[PDB]
Ligand binder design. Structure first.
Ligand SMILES: COc1ccc([C@H](C(=O)Nc2ccc([Si](C)(C)C)cc2)N(C)C(=O)c2cc(=O)[nH]o2)cc1
Length: 215
């Protein structure tokens, strides 16, 4: 696969992300001004831990379906076997969702887009796990600092999915070949856009996955 082929991979990964991104960036930014009042916040705080888990679970499961579409529309993905497709999505879909969420995080006021408005982490008080929530907020904060472009997120989240170190792969070599082609594609596109500096600022390998040890 020469460099003109790798350039099709970039444009293809970026198209799939644009089609499957669930919420437009423009809308998330437009909506940053629309914030939950103290009354509305209290309203969420009063809800049962069960109600809030069912809400968050619904929304996160919805987000997971878009990550499944994203993966389906990657050429290279569908050429993998039935088993490995499941292993990869099992291991990474939620990592991908978390990464995607930074787009819905506003670092000026430490709020996240939830049910039509922006709110802080106190919105989720009824879950009874503010350590988990604070560390998710810090994680979005640190990605927010990078000012990830849409195409950067596209390419990074593909690399989150396509990871040949996942336990239980039957065609390890095949997933490696895909992984290395996406690593190159990412690097090449960063070079085209003079954004090589973001590579050193990316999260460590498995700091993303260690955030799903509590989860
Ligand atoms: C792919 O990126 C996404 C960005 C925002 C949303 C939000 C949401 O889900 N935000 C959200 C959930 C969970 C925690 Si958490 C408990 C991990 C800190 C934070 C924040 N969203 C669309 C909705 O909340 C929503 C309201 C509605 O009526 N239907 O869906 C989903 C996906």
């Amino acid at each position: 696969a020469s460099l003109t082929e790798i350039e099709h991979l970039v444009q293809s990964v970026c198209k799939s992300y644009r089609e499957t991104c669930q919420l437009r960036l423009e809308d998330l930014l437009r909506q940053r001004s629309n914030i939950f009042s103290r009354e509305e916040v209290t309203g969420y705080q009063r809800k049962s831990m069960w109600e809030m888990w069912e809400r968050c679970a619904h929304h996160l499961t919805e987000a997971i379906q878009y990550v499944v579409e994203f993966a389906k529309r990657l050429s290279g993905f569908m050429e993998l076997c039935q088993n490995d497709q499941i292993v990869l999505l099992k291991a990474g879909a939620m990592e991908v969702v978390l990464v995607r969420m930074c787009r819905a995080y506003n670092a000026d006021n430490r709020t996240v887009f939830f049910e039509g408005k922006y709110g802080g982490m106190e919105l989720f008080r009824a879950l009874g796990c503010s350590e988990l929530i604070s560390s998710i907020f810090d994680f979005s904060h640190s990605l927010s600092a990078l000012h990830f472009s849409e195409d950067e997120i596209a390419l990074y989240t593909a690399l989150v999915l396509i990871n040949a170190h996942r336990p239980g792969l039957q065609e390890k070599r095949k997933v490696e070949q895909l992984q290395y082609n996406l690593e190159l594609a990412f690097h090449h596109h960063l070079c085209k856009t003079h954004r090589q500096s973001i590579l050193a600022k990316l999260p460590p390998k498995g700091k993303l996955r260690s955030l799903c040890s509590q989860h």
